[PDB]
Amino acid sequence: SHMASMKHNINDNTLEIVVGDITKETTNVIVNAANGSLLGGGGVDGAIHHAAGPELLKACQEMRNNELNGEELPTGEVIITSGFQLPSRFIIHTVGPIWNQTPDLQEELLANCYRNALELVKVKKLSSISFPSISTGVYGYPIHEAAAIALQTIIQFLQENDVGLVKVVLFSERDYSIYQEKLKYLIEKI
Ligand SMILES: Nc1ncnc2c1ncn2[C@@H]1O[C@H](COP(=O)(O)OP(=O)(O)OC[C@H]2O[C@H](O)[C@H](O)[C@@H]2O)[C@@H](O)[C@H]1O
Structure with missing residues (x-):
């Protein structure tokens, strides 16, 4: 029942970790740590599909067959679907990097997940979004490094743009605990 949280205001935006x-x-909006196929998986992708219900998979399959013409979603890129049975209005699906598959591109690619998702929230005039810890599960991205990239990217975006509430859900x-220490470190540098 105890669930730790902390928040920080950045201009008119709020960043919260929970x-x-x-x-x-x-x-x-909630963000899914998906794979390129968009057909679900385990971890957060599995949780989201289970909670959203079977209409989500159908929607992803139709997006793959029509708008993507069978192509997979590239690493760092995003697509949006309805929330279906989730309490959120929309799900932004992204694909994080698989740790050390592309060592020279992966920091940028992880940042892309966050930047692209936040740009979409802006475009659609949505005012709140939740992220998971993209790529730190099965994709193997070290949490200390990922948390730095996630937070730095979000903080920079919220310094330069009006968005609303960004939550990172751990x-x-x-x-x-690792996010909290990283966030505190980054805040002191502002
Ligand atoms: N319900 C939840 N809410 C928030 N975070 C969660 C939840 N469940 C797990 N996490 C955390 O979510 C974080 C990410 O862990 P992972 O979900 O493996 O995502 P990745 O990007 O590393 O792997 C993507 C692949 O895994 C899938 O099969 C996809 O289809 C891909 O094949 C971790 O901190 C988890 O503990």
């Missing part, structure tokens, strides 16, 4: 389950967030107290 322990929780992203499928229970009532932000306008699934463990271990990840939360």
